[PDB]
Every structure is written in C-alpha cells, then in structure tokens.
Design an enzyme around this catalytic site. Structure first.
Site, mmCIF file in Angstrom:
data_model
loop_
_atom_site.group_PDB
_atom_site.id
_atom_site.type_symbol
_atom_site.label_atom_id
_atom_site.label_comp_id
_atom_site.label_asym_id
_atom_site.label_seq_id
_atom_site.Cartn_x
_atom_site.Cartn_y
_atom_site.Cartn_z
ATOM 1 N N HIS A 1 0.810 -1.150 0.000
ATOM 2 C CA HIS A 1 0.000 0.000 0.000
ATOM 3 C C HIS A 1 0.848 1.205 0.000
ATOM 4 O O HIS A 1 1.980 1.144 -0.543
ATOM 5 C CB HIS A 1 -1.013 -0.071 1.124
ATOM 6 C CG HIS A 1 -0.388 -0.106 2.484
ATOM 7 N ND1 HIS A 1 -1.067 0.280 3.603
ATOM 8 C CD2 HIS A 1 0.912 -0.443 2.880
ATOM 9 C CE1 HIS A 1 -0.231 0.167 4.694
ATOM 10 N NE2 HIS A 1 0.978 -0.281 4.269
ATOM 11 N N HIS B 1 -0.069 -3.100 18.153
ATOM 12 C CA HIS B 1 -1.097 -4.147 18.211
ATOM 13 C C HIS B 1 -0.920 -5.046 19.405
ATOM 14 O O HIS B 1 -1.357 -6.204 19.441
ATOM 15 C CB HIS B 1 -1.026 -4.959 16.951
ATOM 16 C CG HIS B 1 -1.513 -4.164 15.730
ATOM 17 N ND1 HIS B 1 -1.255 -4.572 14.481
ATOM 18 C CD2 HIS B 1 -2.222 -3.008 15.635
ATOM 19 C CE1 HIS B 1 -1.765 -3.655 13.627
ATOM 20 N NE2 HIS B 1 -2.393 -2.749 14.329
ATOM 21 N N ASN C 1 -4.533 -6.967 11.749
ATOM 22 C CA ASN C 1 -4.909 -5.746 12.490
ATOM 23 C C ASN C 1 -6.130 -6.101 13.392
ATOM 24 O O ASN C 1 -7.086 -6.638 12.885
ATOM 25 C CB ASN C 1 -5.256 -4.609 11.588
ATOM 26 C CG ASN C 1 -4.427 -4.576 10.274
ATOM 27 O OD1 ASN C 1 -4.611 -5.490 9.410
ATOM 28 N ND2 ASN C 1 -3.487 -3.615 10.139
HETATM 29 C C1 LIG Z 1 -1.656 5.050 15.766
HETATM 30 C C2 LIG Z 1 -2.045 3.950 14.734
HETATM 31 C C3 LIG Z 1 -2.992 2.935 15.013
HETATM 32 C C4 LIG Z 1 -3.415 1.983 14.066
HETATM 33 C C5 LIG Z 1 -2.912 2.011 12.802
HETATM 34 C C6 LIG Z 1 -1.869 2.963 12.555
HETATM 35 C C7 LIG Z 1 -1.408 3.872 13.509
HETATM 36 C C8 LIG Z 1 -0.216 4.778 13.076
HETATM 37 N N1 LIG Z 1 -3.389 1.232 11.793
HETATM 38 C C9 LIG Z 1 -4.377 0.355 12.129
HETATM 39 C C10 LIG Z 1 -4.598 0.037 13.502
HETATM 40 N N2 LIG Z 1 -5.565 -0.875 13.875
HETATM 41 C C11 LIG Z 1 -6.189 -1.715 12.947
HETATM 42 O O1 LIG Z 1 -7.009 -2.666 13.283
HETATM 43 N N3 LIG Z 1 -5.900 -1.331 11.678
HETATM 44 C C12 LIG Z 1 -5.059 -0.437 11.009
HETATM 45 O O2 LIG Z 1 -4.879 -0.089 9.841
HETATM 46 N N4 LIG Z 1 -4.318 0.947 14.464
HETATM 47 C C13 LIG Z 1 -4.665 0.621 15.872
HETATM 48 C C14 LIG Z 1 -6.066 1.055 16.299
HETATM 49 O O3 LIG Z 1 -6.098 2.465 16.137
HETATM 50 C C15 LIG Z 1 -6.416 0.520 17.672
HETATM 51 O O4 LIG Z 1 -6.523 -0.899 17.547
HETATM 52 C C16 LIG Z 1 -7.731 1.049 18.178
HETATM 53 O O5 LIG Z 1 -7.853 2.445 18.135
HETATM 54 C C17 LIG Z 1 -7.935 0.426 19.586
HETATM 55 O O6 LIG Z 1 -9.206 1.014 20.001
HETATM 56 P P1 LIG Z 1 -9.454 1.136 21.591
HETATM 57 O O7 LIG Z 1 -9.374 -0.204 22.311
HETATM 58 O O8 LIG Z 1 -10.747 1.933 21.735
HETATM 59 O O9 LIG Z 1 -8.224 1.997 22.269
HETATM 60 P P2 LIG Z 1 -7.617 3.444 21.868
HETATM 61 O O10 LIG Z 1 -6.265 3.381 22.398
HETATM 62 O O11 LIG Z 1 -7.898 3.846 20.492
HETATM 63 O O12 LIG Z 1 -8.422 4.380 22.891
HETATM 64 C C18 LIG Z 1 -8.343 4.256 24.261
HETATM 65 C C19 LIG Z 1 -8.701 5.581 24.865
HETATM 66 O O13 LIG Z 1 -8.710 5.514 26.278
HETATM 67 C C20 LIG Z 1 -8.172 6.670 26.852
HETATM 68 N N5 LIG Z 1 -7.653 6.541 28.256
HETATM 69 C C21 LIG Z 1 -6.448 5.991 28.490
HETATM 70 N N6 LIG Z 1 -6.269 6.019 29.803
HETATM 71 C C22 LIG Z 1 -7.412 6.573 30.383
HETATM 72 C C23 LIG Z 1 -7.733 6.822 31.674
HETATM 73 N N7 LIG Z 1 -6.988 6.501 32.741
HETATM 74 N N8 LIG Z 1 -8.947 7.447 31.810
HETATM 75 C C24 LIG Z 1 -9.796 7.765 30.784
HETATM 76 N N9 LIG Z 1 -9.436 7.510 29.548
HETATM 77 C C25 LIG Z 1 -8.247 6.915 29.386
HETATM 78 C C26 LIG Z 1 -7.216 7.182 25.771
HETATM 79 O O14 LIG Z 1 -6.818 8.548 25.897
HETATM 80 C C27 LIG Z 1 -7.838 6.759 24.498
HETATM 81 O O15 LIG Z 1 -8.482 7.828 23.810
#
Ligand SMILES: *Cc1cc2c(cc1C)Nc1c([nH]c(=O)[nH]c1=O)N2C[C@H](O)[C@H](O)[C@H](O)COP(=O)(O)OP(=O)(O)OC[C@H]1O[C@@H](n2cnc3c(N)ncnc32)[C@H](O)[C@@H]1O
Ligand SMILES: *Cc1cc2c(cc1C)Nc1c([nH]c(=O)[nH]c1=O)N2C[C@H](O)[C@H](O)[C@H](O)COP(=O)(O)OP(=O)(O)OC[C@H]1O[C@@H](n2cnc3c(N)ncnc32)[C@H](O)[C@@H]1O
Ligand SMILES: [Mg+2]
Lengths: 581, 572, 51, 52
Positions: free
Chosen positions: A420, A517, A560
């Site tokens: 890609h 991941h 992914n």
């Molecule tokens: C950065 C990135 C990520 C992915 C790709 C590329 C790049 C450069 N490409 C990609 C990925 N995943 C795929 O399946 N396919 C692709 O092409 N990426 C990963 C993907 O982005 C993640 O798998 C996904 O968001 C996971 O979702 P999630 O489980 O909802 O978790 P997040 O990390 O996105 O969000 C968590 C959320 O919680 C907050 N947080 C953390 N600590 C706290 C505390 N203590 N209190 C309250 N909230 C908290 C974070 O700030 C965050 O927003």
C-alpha cells in the site's frame, strides 16, 4: 446511578456507548485526553439543519473524527506522517548515561556516578526486553483519529484443534463458535464501515493487485492477493476519501437529542482507579465506584454506575486495573494484582518488517496498454494524462490513489501482508523520486502467548498523567523468531517481483511495539485459570466489571485487531444490556 | 448583500470580523481550510449541551503538549505547506537498474514543484497554514511592538508612519497598540515564577550592567495566560477574537463562517488601470464534497496572509511563455518591495556554575524560587540539576535598537534533538533566535505564475529575493552578537552551534500588499484601502511597508483595527 | 566527477557564493560528464604496485 | 533483468544464516565501485571489433 460507566473514548469505548445508549441505558464516558478532531453534522429536529453549513447553527460538532480527512492531508499526503508522530506518546523509555565528549567544558554535564534524572524516562525498564515503540494516543477517539483503517478478520483454521489459530474461541463447540463469529463480524463491519471496493478505480491498485495475482498463478506455491478491507468510503468527488473513526460510532449520540440526553462525555477526565467492595482475592466482588479526576483547572469525583467498562487500550486498561489494586485512603517494586492475577501476563505484540520499492520501468508499458478486460476507465484516464503531459515519463495520472492490497494470513504463510502506501518521510536521496511509482510493504508477524511475557506497573514511578509507569518484559519464542525470519524472506521475495528497493527503505525490522497491536494484557476466554475475563469480557469474580480493546484478545495474531476487538465490545455490551437493562 | 466579506480566518481576518460585527455589520468570512482546532465556552461541561464550540483554538493548549512540549514540533511541521519548491533533476546512482528513473532529457514532472523558481533567489522555507485561525493555531505568541526612533526622520524605523506628523503618529500608535494588546491578550508576566526564566533574565542583566555597551534584557511579551494550575498555559489564538461571535446569539446571527471555501478571486466593475473602481463580487468555491458561489457585500477584505493575499489579488487581475507571470496593472505595486527576516540560531547548555546560583540565588527575596528548589532537592536528592521538573522555559528578549538592529529571543521552542544532543536534560538547554531585517527594495518581489498552480488551484507563487549589502553587513553583526551573548551563560550544544537558517523560515514575510502614505510606492493607504478601489481592503503582515526584525502579528492587528474603523465609518 | 551548482541556502549572507548565472569553476570536476551515464565510483590508484 | 534476479538471490542467500545488520540492508552500490571496468582496449579474435 448511571447504567454504564465507560473509561476511554476510542472506537471500543464508543461501541459500548453506542450499543448501550441505543438500548435506552444512561451512559457516562470519561476520556483522559481532549476532544481535538471534529466533523460537523446536522442536529436532528433542528429547523436550521436543512440550511446549515458545517459548524454553523443547525449543526453539532462530533469529536473523534479522522485527522486524515482534512483536505490538506488528502492533497499533501506525506505531511500526515507529522500528525501521527504528534499523536503518539511512547509508553516506556529506558534511562541511559552516555557521555557527550564534545560538550563545552564549563557546562552542566552527567557523570559516571551522577547521571541525569530526566523527566519522562523509566528507570525500571530493561531496554533489551522492552517494546520500545509501543505508544498511546490520548484524545477523543483514541488512536482511531489517525489509524490506517485496515479491518481484516482473524484466521480460523479448518480444524478446530489446530495447534494455532488467530481467531480466539468463544465456545468449545466448533459450530457454535463459527455462528457467533459470523454474527459479530457482520455487525462489527457494519459499525466501522468496512469496504474492499474503495480503490477499485485506482490504476496503481489494480496494476499491483492484478500483476501479483498473474505472477503468483505461475509459481510452485500459489499466493492470493486481495483488496485490503478498509474502514473508509470514497466520496462523491472521487479525489477524496472519508477515513472512518470513532465519530461515526458516536454520531447519533450527538445528533439525536433523545440519545444525547442519555450520554455524558467528560473530556480531560482521568479514570484513576475503580474502587471495589473489598480487596480479598478469589471471592466474589463488585465495583462500588470509579474515581475520576478532572485534569483541567477551572476536581476529584466518584462516579457511580451499575456497570463499569474499562476500554482504555491495551496498556492503559491494564494500568487502571493495576492502580485499582491500591485501595483509596524496593525502588523498582511493581504493583501486585492478586485480585486479577493474570493481568498483564501472556502479552503479545507483532514483529514487523518494512520496505518500499520503485516500480519497474516495464510496468509503465502495462499502464499504457493493460492486458486485462473491463479497463476502459483506465485507458481513458491514461490517455487524458498522456495528452495533458506528453513529456511525463510516468503515464499514471497525477492523482491516482495508492494501492491497497493484502495477502490474507494462512497457516502455511502465517503473517499479515499490506502492500500500500502510508505517509512517509523521504530522505535526501529518496525524495528525488515521484510518489506515483512508490509502493510500501508492511508484513506483521504473530507472537505466541507466554505467561512470562508481561506488562507490569511500577509502584514508585509514574507517567505524565500520574498513572503507574508501565514496564515491559517481552521476549519472543524460538518459533516466533523462526517465523519472523521467514516473514522477512517472503517480503523480499514479494517486493522484488514488481520493483526495486528504494534507497533508504530497504528491507528492515522496525522497533518492537511500532505495530501498536499489543494484546493479551486483560486477556478474555474460556480458560478461567489463565484469563482475566470470560468470553463476554466480564472480569472474573466481579459481577459488574467489563474490559475492552486489543488487550482482551488472548491469541497470537498477525492481522490488524480493531475489527475483532469491536466484536468483543459487541459481545460484552450485549451481556451488559441483558444483565443491567 | 452582506456588509463586509472577509477572505481568511486568521487572527487578522478575525479582528475585522469581531470589530465589524460589534458595530452591527453583517459579516461573511470564508476560510479555505477546515475548522480543525476547538475549545468550548458557555452561551451568553466542555462540548456538551449548553456549551458552544469555538474554532481557531491554539493546538498547544491540549494538555498532551503541555506535558510533552517537544512533541509539538510535529504539529507545526504538519501545519506548514511550503510555498515554492524548485524543480530538480538529481541522479540517484543506487536505484535498482530496472526501476522507473529520471534521465538528463526526461526529468520527472512532479506534483508540487515550481519550475519557475530560481533556487538562489527563493525564500525556500516560506510556508502557509490553511485552517480556521490560520497560523495562530500553532504560533509562539510573541507580540512585541516595533521600534520607533526618537528622530522622526531617522534613516531607518521598524514602526511604519501613519501620519506625516510625529506627534500624531505617536498618538495613533499608542492607541492602536493598546487595543491590539487587549484583542490578542498580550502579557509580560506569565513566566515570572519560572526559575529558568529568572536565572536567564537576571543573570544577563547583571552581566550587561557591567559592560561599556549596556544591553537590556526583558521578558518577551506573549499572547498567553498561565492558568490557576500553574503547570498550564493557555496560548491565545483566533478563538479568543471570535469568541463572542459564537457565544452571543445576537452577534452569531450577523456572522457567517464558510470553511473549506476558497476565495478564488474578486471580480471588479471594470479592468481599466489608474481609474476609480470597485469590487462587484467575490468568486468562492466550496472545496468539500457533500460548486461556485458569487458572494456580494458592500465591502471586501482580503486577509489571507502575506502570500495568499497577494495571490487572491493577482488572480483577480484575470476577468472571469511557459514561465509567464500574471501582470497586475490595476495594483502595480502588488508583490513589490517584499521583506523577510534573516535568522541565526543556536542552543546552549547552561554553565555548571549556574546550578550553584539555582541552589543559592544572590538576588534577595525570591522565596518562591527557594521553596521550589528545596522541594526538588528533597524529593530528588541525587539529581545533579536542582531546577524543578516542570519549571517553565525562559521567555526573554532584547528589544530592537538602532545600535543593535535585530530582534533577540532567548527561550525554548519545541525541538527534535539528534542522537548526540538528546542525552542532555532539557532543563539546562536555552535556545537563541536572532532575527534581522531587510530593506524594502522594488526589485524584491513575489509574482504569480500564469500556467503553474498550487494544490488548491491558485496561481503558483514565485519569489525573487536578494538581500542588500547593508542587510548582509547587519546580518554578520547579528551573528557575532548571538555568539557573544550566548556564550555568557552557556556553551553551544553539539548539533546546534551558531548557524543561519533557511531564508523564509521566520514566516515574517511582509510588504506584499504594502500600505502607507506614499501612494506611488504602495498598494494601499494607511487605512489599508487599496488604491482606486472604494470598497477593497487588505490585512496581514503583507501590509507592513518597513523593514522590521520583530514579530509582526501585533502590528498587523493594529492595521486591522485601523482598517476596520474605516470600514465602520464608511459602510456604517 | 560531474559539475553541479547546488544552492546552499544557509550560507552566511556576506560570503562568496555560487549563483544561477555564475557557478563555481572548481578544480577536479568534469564539465563534460553526464551524471546519468557515469561510472561515478570508478577510481584509480597511482603508486608502485597499482591497486 | 539479471541485476534484479541477482538482488533477489542475495536476499534469499543471506537470510539463510542471518539477519540484515541495520544500515547494511540489501542495496545496489554506485556504478563503478567494483573497479572491474574492462573492454577499454579490448583484445580478441574479431579484428574489426577489437583494439588488439
Ligand atoms: C496510531 C495507529 C494505530 C493503528 C494504525 C496505525 C497507527 C499509526 N493502523 C491500524 C490500527 N488498527 C487496525 O485494526 N488497523 C489499522 O490499519 N491501528 C490501531 C487502532 O487504532 C487501535 O486498535 C484502536 O484504536 C484500539 O481502540 P481502543 O481499544 O478503543 O483503544 P484506543 O487506544 O484507540 O483508545 C483508548 C482511549 O482511552 C483513553 N484513556 C487511556 N487512559 C485513560 C484513563 N486513565 N482514563 C480515561 N481515559 C483513558 C485514551 O486517551 C484513548 O483515547
Ligand atoms: C507557523 C508559525 C507562526 C508564527 C510563529 C511560529 C510559527 C512556527 N511565531 C510567531 C509568529 N508571529 C508573531 O507575531 N509572533 C510569534 O511568536 N508567527 C506568525 C503568525 O502566526 C502570523 O503572523 C499570523 O497568524 C498572521 O495572521 P493573518 O494575517 O491572519 O494570516 P494567517 O496566515 O494566520 O491566516 C490567513 C488565513 O487565510 C486563509 N486563506 C489563504 N488563502 C485563502 C483563500 N484563497 N481563500 C480563503 N482563505 C484563504 C488561510 O488558510 C489562513 O487560514
Ligand atoms: Mg453498512
């Protein structure tokens, strides 16, 4: 009390919110980061809505929008790499005490026994067993505001007792497991908006896809190339794509006044810990409240709900639950987690190899005169470009989308292949080359879950948000290594069929953790003794505590994970609805 | 018709919007980029019901960037689109021999390059930001005044003349700068309880009071305010200017902001040079998918930044050989006399002897310092640096004088450290940025290409910029001054030794739509009304007609005030 | 070694510089060499015993 | 065509016993670096195409 408390506003937390609010539950979501990326949609029922312009009256802003959707980045795609870099906070940076020999001799200096003590480093991290590129994004929508949107399914072997599978088991009966997954994947794809057809009118995509399939039909081992499933849709102006993110999951909780009245989203609010009924291991328990702190000055709040979901991503979900082992009121000691003894154990992360190539000159003749039927759109685009720019050595039109090609994981070649383009930062030799003839390769391997691979949390060191410092102890197995070598070999073999390596992007391993991941930190499954939660992601011994995210996934997988993690969020939400609705 | 049409939503455009709406005028503002950075305020919990979203908020205000300041360099790099990148045809000797390649006779034809740009006369680092709030969503917020010498007929001044009468000129500028400072929220006190800021400022003053040529160090004026939790600063941006236009429903009702809408060109009553004229309408295109609108107003303001203001007005010379530029005979000084600032840079590591200063400051009465140092030293007894961990950077300046005619900032900008440099603790690094000026000269120009276009389909900018002999003499003196000053308190950090930066990196391009009293050498008058158009005004750094060294935004805000008042007088 | 006339954008503005019209003439470069058909790393050793 | 196959061969061979050292990943070298230039005074049986 709220019906459901959710920590984290990434796509997993947002799926819980959407499903629960759609089932008439009242939801309180906290997000540690800011709302920092928005789109605008008409508010339902507002009489200014029909007339409205974006962010004008009649419209509401919807956070968690994909940052790549801004037109500037659809026009100048390599600039987006800076956005990604700006959004990633590295989890665990080890200390070092290197001598800088050419300091001016009068200036502050480190020494052998007074090293610097520097903000941001983890003195407990051993660099050799780290995931040095593992990073987090804090903001509404989590990492979904910058992800590449790939949404494959995980491989399930024909034999249910095969020694490896990517897709975890949700039942001990093979037929029921298949039933359950087919329903969940269908719904996860609908929530995130998966498509394999949004690059069907790209010359580059079709060139790469078709050529590879033609090449590999003639070889001793057959390999199938297919469009990469992506959470995106190409727009009515086909020069633009809308990359999908948490905004589409949250949308109606903002646009629909009835749903909005059942949803509260508190940004810049840290879930510090959950407070439990008691602290006795092995005994039935319950969450009593969430301890949340407002991080902006204008602050410590107890939030009561009937059920609690920690959906803070794979590091931070474990972090919250580790911190929760310290009830409210050795330097390198870590927090014992006897209430959840498998927390942070069996962690997995994907090794990754990368390269870029320049397409072969011979393929430009294929662009000018393609052999496959049904390609008059291609011929017309090429003829337009060649007549507009007759001195251009490259006949690909200027805004042709990049390729979006995959080879799905198999047991015979057990890694995940993406072919890609991502945004990339060209060096002084490589920026002399035209973007149209570059193709990137990213191959992701799996690691076996092993009890000794762990994420642990420091008692005495803290991150920038005052949460326990994460420390990684990660070492791949001999079989993991052997597959990783095969994977690198495969990448060289495949890349070289259609191009030659671009200087500065020759075949290489990336820093461990760069895939992001990471999994298995709160692993969920049927084996109660080796998991943190059950197949509904309910934490053992806790009647009202659920987890979400890639951390729930208990297998070693290479594809992914986001789509599969959405499946678990569905399944968990449905359990919450049944128990707490 | 609207009363006022405004192209651009940077802090200048926003100032015209605020003042015109406040005067009960109906305003349509168009912005080529997206609304992509927001805060929320209550109508007269953030982003819930009851709150109103306000675009153009400073990106550095996100807590993530206050906790990890070096990460913010990526945000800035992501925000800047380079104006003019010359073509090149370099041989890459190590390409695989089978791949697509350039040749001597068949170079690549590549999107985003300007075949007409001579690299030796470029401003190669000049760039723009497209989004609500323009560059104000990432700027460093420095808001000094420009230097006005004691003698009104001095051969150089930074602050332009707005009257031929000295006293009157002084009166006007006193009022404008006071109002500008209130609009953008200038303050000189937000770093007064930083150990690093005070060590630098007080040490340098102590040093330079003992020298035969006195130099005065002062706090850099910054459009920001430290919050009640002093680990945090709110950096100001266009949100603060637009706030009331969003929070007051009466004002909201007179203000329309169309985002992702390009002001392609203005269309004039006619195309005869030298004769009285007017704008008939703005040609605007909606760039988002879900077409071209004529937007009619009584007056028009182009506030698109220094490059893009001139670009819109050049494109307007076309009613609705390869290297030919667009002639602009209706505005014959458009793009002429352009100025940009040469810049030198280095970083130092503070002298080890200064740590004993931190431990035992020799200035009396600094209880706040001694208490913070005591807490640090008790919590981290083996830290060799006694400065506390989240101690703010220094924010220090030497005000431009004619004896040392450059602008000095002694501070920390977000910076990406190499392999040698990031072994050093951030608390002991200080950055030096010295900005010089260039004399306005008619032959220094910004011109626009007929047959080449930028990524938004506007005429491609091409620079022809060469500094004078006096500009060069001053720049050598500036470099020498920087070496001398920096070495008083520290030693050069490897990789950041004294150096010139790429021309244009300052982003203080001026004089592209220059406004002033000399009608024959200006695009507009001292109210920024374009000559021969009764209803067309310009805004931004491009209006400034002098060679200046200091940061221009505050001064451009003054001109936006003055223009706005002319619009209000005439079209109210 | 082919000639080149690359702009060094960060030279001190008072110093000797090349320009578009007045490139350097530098000993040791071959103005006739087209870089795209060169053997740019071909080299000789002059001394008893050669290479 | 042979150069590409050579590069493919090298990647295949090298990976049998080790893994690329960072900075020394598979790459082409600047033309002439081999210093094996030949045929400049070429000698052989075909008098019309040779120097000697
Ligand atoms: C950065 C990135 C990520 C992915 C790709 C590329 C790049 C450069 N490409 C990609 C990925 N995943 C795929 O399946 N396919 C692709 O092409 N990426 C990963 C993907 O982005 C993640 O798998 C996904 O968001 C996971 O979702 P999630 O489980 O909802 O978790 P997040 O990390 O996105 O969000 C968590 C959320 O919680 C907050 N947080 C953390 N600590 C706290 C505390 N203590 N209190 C309250 N909230 C908290 C974070 O700030 C965050 O927003
Ligand atoms: C990027 C940057 C900027 C400054 C500093 C540091 C950095 C890395 N530091 C700084 C500066 N200025 C100072 O006085 N002190 C400081 O410490 N920076 C420069 C400052 O940011 C600018 O001077 C200021 O914004 C200028 O304001 P403006 O005259 O309002 O211009 P902008 O470029 O901000 O906004 C213009 C605006 O117009 C839009 N545009 C462009 N063309 C069109 C068309 N054709 N149609 C509609 N809209 C258009 C742009 O998209 C932009 O948003
Ligand atoms: Mg659907």
């Amino acid at each position: 009390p709220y019906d459901v408390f959710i920590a984290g506003s990434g796509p997993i937390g947002a799926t819980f919110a959407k499903l629960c609010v759609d089932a008439n539950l009242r939801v309180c979501m906290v997000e540690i980061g800011a709302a920092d990326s928005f789109t605008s949609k008409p508010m339902k029922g507002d009489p200014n809505a029909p007339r409205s312009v974006q962010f004008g009256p009649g419209q509401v802003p919807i956070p968690g929008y994909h940052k790549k959707n801004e037109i500037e980045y659809q026009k100048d795609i390599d600039r987006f790499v800076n956005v990604i870099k700006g959004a990633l906070s590295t989890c665990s940076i080890p200390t070092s005490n290197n001598h800088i020999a050419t300091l001016d001799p009068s200036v502050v200096s480190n020494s052998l026994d007074k090293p610097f003590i520097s903000l941001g480093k983890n003195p407990a991290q051993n660099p050799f067993v780290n995931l040095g590129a593992e990073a987090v994004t804090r903001g509404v929508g989590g990492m979904s505001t910058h992800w590449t949107c790939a949404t494959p399914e995980f491989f399930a072997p024909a034999d249910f007792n095969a020694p490896h599978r990517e897709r975890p088991k949700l039942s001990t009966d093979a037929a029921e497991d298949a039933r359950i997954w087919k329903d969940l994947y269908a719904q996860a794809k609908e929530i995130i908006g998966t498509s394999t057809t949004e690059f069907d009118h790209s010359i580059r995509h079709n060139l790469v896809l078709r050529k590879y399939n033609d090449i590999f039909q003639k070889e001793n081992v057959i390999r199938e190339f297919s469009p990469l499933p992506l959470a995106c849709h190409r727009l009515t102006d086909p020069d633009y794509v809308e990359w999908h993110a948490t905004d589409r999951i949250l949308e109606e909780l903002f646009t629909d006044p009835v749903k909005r009245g059942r949803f509260t989203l508190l940004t810049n609010h840290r879930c510090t810990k959950l407070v439990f009924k008691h602290y006795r291991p092995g005994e039935e328990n319950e969450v009593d409240y969430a301890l949340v702190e407002d991080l902006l000055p204008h602050s410590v709040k107890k939030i009561y709900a009937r059920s609690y979901v920690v959906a803070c991503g794979a590091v931070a979900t474990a972090q919250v639950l580790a911190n929760s082992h310290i009830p409210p009121d050795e330097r390198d000691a870590t927090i014992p987690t006897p209430l959840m003894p498998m927390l942070g154990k069996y962690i997995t992360e994907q090794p990754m190899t990368f390269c870029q190539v320049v397409l072969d000159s011979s393929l430009m003749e294929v662009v000018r005169n393609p052999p496959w039927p049904g390609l008059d759109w291609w011929k017309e685009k090429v003829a337009r470009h060649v007549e507009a720019f007759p001195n251009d050595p490259i006949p690909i039109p200027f805004r042709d989308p990049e390729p979006q090609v995959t080879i799905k994981f198999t047991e015979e070649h057990p890694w995940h292949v993406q072919i890609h383009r991502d945004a990339f930062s060209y060096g002084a030799v490589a920026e002399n080359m035209d973007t149209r003839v570059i193709v990137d390769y990213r191959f992701f391997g799996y690691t076996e879950p092993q009890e000794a691979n762990e994420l642990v949390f420091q008692q005495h060191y803290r991150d920038a948000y005052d949460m326990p410092q994460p420390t990684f102890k990660f070492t791949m197995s001999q079989d993991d290594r052997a597959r990783a070598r095969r994977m690198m070999d495969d990448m060289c073999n495949i890349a070289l069929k259609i191009g030659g390596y671009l200087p500065g992007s020759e075949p290489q391993f990336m820093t461990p953790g760069l895939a992001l991941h990471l999994a298995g930190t709160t692993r969920c499954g049927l084996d109660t003794q080796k998991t943190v939660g059950n197949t509904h992601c309910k934490v053992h011994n806790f009647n009202n505590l659920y987890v979400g995210g890639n951390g729930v996934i208990e297998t070693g997988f290479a594809a992914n994970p986001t789509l599969t993690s959405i499946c678990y969020a569905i399944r968990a939400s449905n359990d919450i609805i049944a128990k707490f609705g």
